[PDB]
């Protein structure tokens, strides 16, 4: 039986868990026919790479598994949402989604088209010219003859706005469900396992938690989450120690307390298309909008919306979309993250400089007043150190920017009195706010690059010593040839665990095998003791036969 | 070749072969590899600077047009902010190179209106495209040197712990005096393996010994299971006599 093994090999999953016997067991299952095909997508590989990076460095050891399972659940909803878009009065409804699924499909190319159009319109914008004569001053559009120059700008301006409108709808059809599912998952746990709304309450802070109180009693709370029993599950748990009707009225389910048990009566709604369609949860939709108007990416997309719209009026305003470069052209994001990594302590240096120059100004005003004359032609009618605001501004605007200290712009101290006090004032100013205080700015960047480059090495090195599931080092596995290489690809593959939750959820509860139900039992209970965490099934049976 | 040939005509053209220095004088190759190691992300900063100065130009053209007069002798016939190409070029050619920001070449804003808008425009320009954007250039070199110097340490350190053929660490071999020193020079010498393929290829296939043909068989088959990769013949027979 060779060909039968080779043909079925790419589908035979292999997971290694422990439990129900205080030993380590091994489970096999059928992975997929299409999920195995999709798993190798750049948006998924990059997502996994990013997830790995923020676990090794900003990840606690105790809760390492928990957030890994959270990302595991997230990828499943990504699978479900991505599996859909892939391909005269009531027939328009199907054709609408038949086009929306196309819009959300090639979202990234549509987005890149917006940047390209912004680049083109910016280039054509490079020919305006002021003129005090109609071809008050007019912004006459000069061109290298070639009359076809002005008509093109109008069509390009319209097309840019159209593409910018399309990408918003694409974003809505592509990313919004993910964030909604995220919030639903995060909220459902704080009720079943915590008393965030039952026993504890938000402490007048956490507007994110305060805003969620408007979704508890809606008829359809878990709209995107899988488990639809989140109400009944917490009802029993907190309905005895607390007021059963008190918990009932909080989560809604109007008259369902009796309808839960007394369901002897049966359940036909009349066909009311476009007649009773306005029967929607006015309280759930406002909550969804409140969540959606807080996401940063959607807000930036709306900002890009607003500037494009504010086009067709002072066309120059189009030259702000060019800053989309950043969120694009990857390279930059890393370069800009280098400087952004020390932002909290960068502007504070600017504040320190603003304080030090003020300190110098109070001295120059008290003693060096008669030196700052601008020495006009055959007259001295102007002096900068007459007030505080008009003198401190001089140091702030010319002093720090002098490139050589303030001593360049002041009249040369060739006089006798105060000859040394002025020289010390000049030299200290040069040594403090030009050499030192403009070196800390560079220092907060030189090591800023070093840290972003160094953190990568650690996540690279840790993956080459530990299995990230078991705590076993690489040496022990390297006892056999390529033992560690096989351990991270056959036994603890970090991808069969991906493929195991899909097998569990899709399978109905009735046909769960002896083991698959038990791990399902803890997964419902949210306990992570079934992961190996210490043993590897060959450290277990090394003595007997290995 | 081509430049030397194109000599005997405008002899000055000979002064391009001098750049052979690089591929020579070793030292340089390392120094130039330092800057070259970050080339993919160095010119992109220049592009970013070219974008930012354009962003500043669109503002200076719309509001600060009447400030850029060059103030000729007893007359004002020249202005730089009349078009886009002839004004953006001014910022690109004098602004970024001013060494002190654009505020040096423009007429001093001693007037009342726009007194603060011009000062903010000057200060932000100084703080963004002179201090910051000319510090990332130096940053992409300071750590560029550090990386080329650090990668050497790793290849130095790994050769002092593992045999590069066997995966065994140095400790275990250091059980006997100078055990690791002998392991990398007698048993897994990384140079006898050089001298073994020459012995195999030169020898005719007919006279291959019992073992030399078998390793030859996998070498023809291109399988690398005959390398030790885990054991060292003394971890193998330590119990019996060792």
Curated annotation (Swiss-Prot), chain B:
Annotated residues for binding of ATP: 159-164, 184-190
Parts of the chain on the Cytoplasmic side: 26-40, 146-242
Membrane-crossing residue ranges in chain numbering: 9-25, 41-61, 125-145
Motif (Selectivity filter): 99-105
Chain ranges inside the bilayer that never cross it: 85-104
Binding site for Ca(2+): 206
Assembly notes: Homotetramer. Can also form heterotetramers with RYR2. Identified in a complex composed of RYR1, PDE4D, PKA, FKBP1A and protein phosphatase 1 (PP1). Repeated very high-level exercise decreases interaction with PDE4D and protein phosphatase 1 (PP1). Interacts with CALM; CALM with bound calcium inhibits the RYR1 channel activity. Interacts with S100A1. Interacts with FKBP1A; this stabilizes the closed conformation of the channel. Interacts with CACNA1S; interaction with CACNA1S is important for activation of the RYR1 channel. Interacts with CACNB1.
Additional note from the record: Binding of [3H]ryanodine indicates that the heterozygous channel is activated by Ca(2+) concentrations 4-fold lower than normal. Single-cell analysis of cotransfected cells shows a significantly increased resting cytoplasmic Ca(2+) level and a significantly reduced luminal Ca(2+) level.
Protein's recorded name: Ryanodine receptor 1
Organism name: Oryctolagus cuniculus
């Amino acid at each position: 039986a060779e060909s039968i093994l080779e043909y079925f090999r790419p589908y035979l999953g292999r997971i290694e868990i422990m439990g129900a016997s205080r030993r380590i067991e091994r489970i096999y299952f059928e992975i997929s026919e299409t999920n195995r095909a999709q798993w190798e997508m750049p948006q998924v590989k990059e997502s996994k790479r990013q997830f790995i990076f923020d676990v090794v460095n900003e990840g606690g050891e105790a809760e390492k598994m928990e957030l890994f399972v959270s990302f595991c659940e997230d990828t499943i909803f990504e699978m479900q949402i991505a599996a859909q878009i892939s391909e005269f009065w009531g027939e328009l409804e199907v054709q609408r989604v038949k086009f929306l699924n196309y819009l959300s499909r090639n979202f990234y190319t549509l987005r890149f088209l917006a940047l390209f159009l912004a680049f083109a319109i910016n280039f054509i914008l490079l020919f305006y010219k002021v003129s005090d004569s109609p071809p008050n001053m007019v912004y006459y559009f000069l061109e290298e003859s070639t009359g076809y120059m002005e008509p093109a700008l109008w069509c390009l301006s319209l097309l840019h706005t159209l593409v910018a409108f399309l990408c918003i709808i694409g974003y809505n059809c592509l990313k919004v469900p993910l964030v909604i599912f995220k919030r639903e998952k995060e909220l459902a746990r704080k009720l079943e396992f915590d008393g965030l709304y039952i026993t504890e309450q938000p402490g007048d802070d956490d507007v994110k938690g305060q805003w969620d109180r408007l979704v508890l009693n809606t008829p359809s709370f878990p709209s995107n989450y899988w488990d639809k029993f989140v109400k009944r599950k917490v009802l029993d748990k907190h309905g005895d120690i607390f007021g059963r009707e008190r918990i009932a009225e909080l989560l809604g389910m109007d008259l369902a307390s009796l309808e839960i048990t007394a369901h002897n009566e049966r359940k036909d709604p009349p066909p009311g298309l476009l007649t009773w369609l306005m029967s929607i949860d006015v309280k759930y939709q406002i909550w969804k909008f409140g969540v959606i108007f807080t996401d940063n990416s959607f807000l930036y997309l709306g900002w890009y919306m607003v500037m494009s719209l504010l086009g067709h009026y002072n066309n120059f305003f189009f030259a702000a979309h060019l800053l989309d470069i950043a969120m694009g052209v990857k390279t930059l994001r890393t370069i800009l993250s280098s400087v952004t990594h020390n932002g909290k302590q960068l502007v504070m240096t600017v504040g320190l400089l603003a304080v030090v120059v003020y300190l110098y100004t109070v001295v120059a005003f008290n003693f060096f007043r008669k030196f700052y004359n601008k020495s006009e032609d055959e007259d001295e009618p102007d002096m900068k150190c007459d007030d505080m605001m008009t003198c401190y501004l001089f140091h702030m605007y010319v002093g720090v920017r002098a490139g050589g200290g303030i001593g360049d712009e002041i009249e040369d101290p060739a006089g006798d009195e105060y000859e040394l006090y002025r020289v010390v004032f000049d030299i200290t100013f040069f040594f403090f706010v030009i050499v030192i205080l403009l070196a800390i700015i560079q220092g907060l960047i030189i090591d800023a690059f070093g840290e972003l480059r160094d953190q990568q090495e650690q996540v690279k090195e840790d993956m080459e010593t530990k299995c990230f599931i078991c705590g076993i080092g690489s040496d022990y596995f390297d006892t056999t040839p390529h033992g560690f290489e096989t351990h991270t690809l056959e036994e603890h593959n970090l991808a069969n665990y991906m493929f195991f939750l899909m097998y569990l959820i899709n399978k109905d509860e009735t046909e769960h095998t002896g083991q698959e139900s038990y791990v399902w039992k803890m997964y419902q209970e949210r306990c992570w003791d079934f992961f190996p965490a210490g043993d590897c099934f060959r450290k277990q049976y090394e003595d007997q036969l290995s």
